[PDB]
């Protein structure tokens, strides 16, 4: 109907749109009609309709300036509606762009605008752009202000105020707010959650009146720093079109005593007075830290004022409060109950596709060279948040500048445009930037996604089926459990010799049910025990709840399970709701050393043995670790697998690594002497000559004895 296709208009007029005759008949439009056109980002404009049969039915033509104003590209769909109630502009104040007006003498108004508006009746709306082509020059302008507001028709008698200081162009670009969803990638799940939690209360309030419920108000986002929380909040606010009222934490806390409270009160009052609105309290942890932190009165009055304001807004006002904190435990506990920030959202490091999306988003203004393999960079960047990727791009560009610096005269302040053209980033530059990268997200526990199937784990079919029936069935067929009245099992404990690949089994289990994975290695547990860490077990389980369905993994639990930490872990495990799809998987090498309390029913009761890989399993592991390596044609690893009886997966990795080391040594020696694109069987034999088992016979016998004891304990 009104979803007209966008196309480039022949005319250069800034307020003229050509439409097809068929569409004109459908919409009952006519030549010269002023119509309101809406595109994307809620952008709107006023265009004079002109019949044009050249366009295909259902298509319209607009010029470059109108498309730029509408923030839309050719081929999109725009909605055109009648605008019969547009009045003549009583007074329009307009200012030019400085860079455009450079080199112009005389009165700009007479030169450009006076012929442009006389006998033109061009509709003008605030925030629009119009370009005047006079003589040999072309100058753009802005619709700074219109009376009556917000738009009106510039008639012959309309007064135009061109007086005013030039407007810098840098503000429009470098201040690129109004960022849409297209500027956020790799976090579609959390973006969808925030959208479904914010848009519907504001865009369609009548829904909840029809259902007769009070929609949730508070929202609390948290995650590692640099994951785009502020960017997501800004994008949601801009798309929703609400009265955004960004509030910073450090900014509020930097005011004199007795002023931060006033700022908070004024902010909340203005947000209420202009409903609907969206208040974003950035870095709330800087306003209301944990109780054990600063006890100063100035640090308590602000928290009390914030609590009072949060409790006082419960009314028919459309106010939504969004807060961002690095960790959930930093905020005062009082801010996590009903009527307050009761809804939580967790941001985690992206996967390969997310990193690719981030790279493409950032690497659209770069003058990249042809040899770009963004997929390769995404594969080789693990654990990078968006900020790290942006820094990587900046460093790569700086490296390219350094490389091209040879053709630059530093003393001279002007650089040849030819040299500027030659600038282009290359894959080597990105590799160097990675070499100079300093990721820091992984220093703490963070939600992440894994993509391991039942192919990187060789053999162990019975274990695979046991894990499937333990985990996958509850998630996919909970209705059956309800029908039979059986509560799903919470977690399991993997025990066995080191290197059996327990982490791989955990990752596979997480992948099958499409669940986020959280890892807690031994050093993290020790740091928590000493109390010098930035996070605590309660925080870990809160994040697990927030990012459900999650899978928490503990490694070498025997170090702490040899106790305050174990008590906290038991309390948290008992606390969690059974229905929540949260699974705690523990890995250890000395099960008998584990505290018996951990093994009680209702806890990590199920005990699963992870045996060493067998011949076929070893062959599969070797083939898997060598899939992306150039091997000798006609080479067979069956003999090597047969000869490696009793070796663990880590041992096979070590053998392959030594073979690769010998291959690279030989290749480098040959190149220096100057061939060997692959690895010959002699390298594998040399590597195997140094093979050494990582498991002693006594320990394996002890594991077998423990397994036999466990089987006897269940054999009657």
């Amino acid at each position: 109907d009104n979803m007209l296709l966008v196309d480039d208009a022949i005319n250069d007029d800034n307020s003229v749109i050509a439409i097809n005759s068929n569409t004109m008949d459908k919409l009952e439009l006519f030549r010269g009609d002023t119509v309101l056109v809406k595109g994307k980002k809620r952008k709107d404009t006023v265009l004079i309709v002109l019949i044009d049969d050249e366009l295909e039915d259902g298509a319209c033509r607009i010029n470059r300036v109108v498309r730029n104003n509408l923030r839309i590209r050719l081929g999109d769909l725009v909605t055109i509606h009648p605008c019969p109630d547009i009045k003549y502009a009583t007074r329009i104040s307009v200012l030019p762009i400085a860079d455009t007006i450079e080199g112009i003498t005389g009165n700009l108004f007479d030169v450009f605008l006076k012929p442009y508006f006389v006998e033109a009746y061009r509709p003008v709306r605030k925030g629009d752009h119009f370009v005047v082509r006079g003589g040999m020059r072309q100058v753009e302008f802005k619709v700074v202000d219109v009376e009556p507001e917000e738009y009106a028709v510039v008639a012959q008698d309309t007064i135009i105020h061109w007086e005013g200081e030039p407007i810098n162009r840098e503000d429009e670009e470098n201040n690129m707010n109004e960022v849409g969803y297209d500027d956020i990638g790799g976090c579609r799940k959390q973006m969808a959650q925030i959208r479904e939690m914010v848009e519907l209360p504001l865009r369609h309030p009548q829904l909840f009146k029809a259902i007769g419920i009070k929609p949730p108000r508070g929202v609390l986002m948290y995650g590692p720093p640099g994951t785009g929380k502020t960017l997501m909040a800004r994008a949601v606010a801009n798309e929703t079109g609400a009265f955004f009222f960004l509030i910073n934490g450090p900014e509020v806390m930097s005011k004199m005593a007795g002023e931060s409270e006033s700022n908070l009160r004024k902010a909340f009052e203005e947000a209420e007075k202009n409903a609907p609105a969206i208040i974003f309290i950035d870095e709330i942890d800087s306003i209301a830290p944990k109780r054990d932190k600063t006890n100063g009165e100035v640090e308590r009055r602000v928290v009390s004022q914030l609590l009072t304001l949060m409790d006082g807004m419960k009314a028919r006002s459309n106010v939504v409060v969004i807060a961002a904190t690095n960790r959930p435990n930093s905020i005062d506990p009082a801010l996590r109950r009903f009527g307050r920030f009761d809804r939580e959202v967790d941001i985690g490091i992206p996967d390969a596709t997310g990193r690719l999306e981030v790279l493409r988003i950032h690497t659209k203004n770069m003058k990249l060279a042809d040899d770009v393999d963004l997929e390769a960079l995404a594969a080789e960047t693990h654990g990078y948040v968006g900020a790290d990727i942006a820094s990587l791009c900046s460093e790569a560009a700086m490296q390219q500048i350094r490389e091209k610096m040879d053709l630059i005269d530093l003393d001279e302040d002007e650089i040849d445009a030819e040299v500027l053209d030659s600038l282009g980033v290359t894959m080597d530059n990105f590799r160097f930037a990675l070499g100079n990268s300093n990721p820091s997200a992984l220093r703490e526990t963070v939600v992440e996604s894994v993509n391991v199937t039942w192919d990187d784990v060789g053999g162990l079919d019975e274990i695979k089926e046991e894990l499937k029936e333990t985990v996958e069935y509850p998630v996919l067929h909970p209705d059956q459990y309800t029908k039979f009245g059986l509560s799903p099992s919470k977690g399991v404990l993997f025990y066995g010799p080191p290197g059996t690949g327990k982490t791989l089994l955990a990752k596979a289990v997480a992948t099958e049910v499409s669940a986020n994975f959280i890892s807690v290695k031994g050093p993290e547990l020790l740091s928590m025990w000493y109390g010098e860490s930035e996070s605590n077990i309660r925080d870990i389980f809160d994040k697990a709840r927030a990012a459900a369905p999650t899978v928490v993994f503990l490694d070498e639990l025997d170090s702490i399970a040899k106790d305050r930490v174990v008590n906290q872990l038991l309390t948290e495990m008992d606390g969690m709701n059974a229905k929540k799809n949260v699974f705690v998987i523990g890995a250890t090498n000395r099960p008998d050393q584990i505290d018996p309390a951990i093994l009680r029913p209702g806890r990590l009761d199920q005990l699963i043995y992870v045996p060493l890989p067998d011949e076929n399993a070893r062959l599969s592991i070797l083939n898997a670790q060598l899939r992306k390596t150039p091997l000798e044609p006609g080479l067979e690893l069956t003999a090597i697998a047969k000869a490696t009886q009793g070796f663990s997966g880590a041992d096979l990795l070590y053998i392959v690594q030594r073979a690769a080391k010998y291959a690279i040594k030989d290749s480098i020696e040959a190149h220096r002497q100057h061939p060997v694109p692959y690895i010959t069987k002699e390298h594998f034999a040399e590597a195997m000559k140094t093979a050494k088992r990582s498991v002693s016979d006594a320990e394996l016998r002890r594991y077998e004895a423990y397994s036999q004891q466990m089987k006897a304990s269940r054999g009657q």
Partner: protein
Amino acid sequence: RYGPLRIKELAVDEELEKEDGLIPRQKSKLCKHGDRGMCEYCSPLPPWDKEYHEKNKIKHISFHSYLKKLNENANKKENGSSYISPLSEPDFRINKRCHNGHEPWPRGICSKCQPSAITLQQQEFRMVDHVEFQKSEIINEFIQAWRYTGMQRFGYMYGSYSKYDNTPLGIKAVVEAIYEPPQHDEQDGLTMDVEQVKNEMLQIDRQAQEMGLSRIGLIFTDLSDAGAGDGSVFCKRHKDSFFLSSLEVIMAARHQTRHPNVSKYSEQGFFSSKFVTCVISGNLEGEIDISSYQVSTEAEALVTADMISGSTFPSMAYINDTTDERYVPEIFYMKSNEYGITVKENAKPAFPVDYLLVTLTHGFPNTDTETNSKFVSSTGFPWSNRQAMGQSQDYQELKKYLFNVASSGDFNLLHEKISNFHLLLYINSLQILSPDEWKLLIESAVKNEWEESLLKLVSSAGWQTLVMILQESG
């Protein structure tokens, strides 16, 4: 409104806002840096720097500079907010409708709509800085009123505002004429029905606006004669005594509340009326020195919700009692001791008014500069409401005053006699002149380049009738 409010205000405010007022400073001898690059002592001094004001013997900070300080203190550009109005006039009246679950104040109140304790403190910014009397005659006639009758007086003072270079971003109110409302003056005080005063002043101010003036304060005389041979007067208003007793403070606060100053930086659009009150008391010697004052903004918003009344002690203002429709929270007045520590003293029975005032600097135009006085007059046709004295406006005085000049010519002499404020008001009161004829009369009498307009005026039949009836009348 996604930014600063949109409204049109006085030209003085606009031009002052355009400036920034930075006071440049040169290389200090303590700097350690090359020629270019300023470290900490060579930076420009902001206009609100209290050290400069107190070092130059200026007690207040030229309100516009205070606005600049407030704007700089917050409201980061391009981000950090969506604009918060920096100026808000305090209001103490209890919110009649809060309803967290309670009923209105008369029979229910919560802790969210309870007027919090008020901390009285001397204001730091004075709206209008310098009150300037164009000519000595304007106030000499006023004091001559007291001389002749012996009773006190009271009169509004019309005028216009302008810049004041002598102070950073300062404003001066130049007073052009004085109009005396009908009042019943007496030895110890004066009285006047408010209804008549406001009804008369509405039309008088309409005519003044037509003339280009504006009501910019009230002036009253508190003078007593001494026993010396000549005319000497006691100085009853000094540091020890009361500068302004309770009642005058109350009246000034009411007047300010009823003459709001339109501003672009408040939610309501008004803040701290630019109204100046002048009192004549006499300096430490027997002279007849004048003074100026202005009640602070808190007192402006304090009297509106009653809460204050006069006290038999001249220097202290009584505090009323709680009752329905009038909730009065505890009032703490904050002072400073000799040890540099602020002390809060509860003063419920009564507290001094020194914390509700700001003092302005009176003066007269330099006697060696261009003369831009609207009216070269005020020694002539007697002023309006001097019925108590012999002065009385009527046909006979016009015949004696403005007949021989018109009957012959000499337009140069005529112009000054036609540029008298009260003369214009009286002739307009007669209603003899037609509207447009009166408009061109005022345009000739209050503007330069008046030859053609004056000739046209004397041409119009209205003036012919005026002169004819004047001559015919005794």
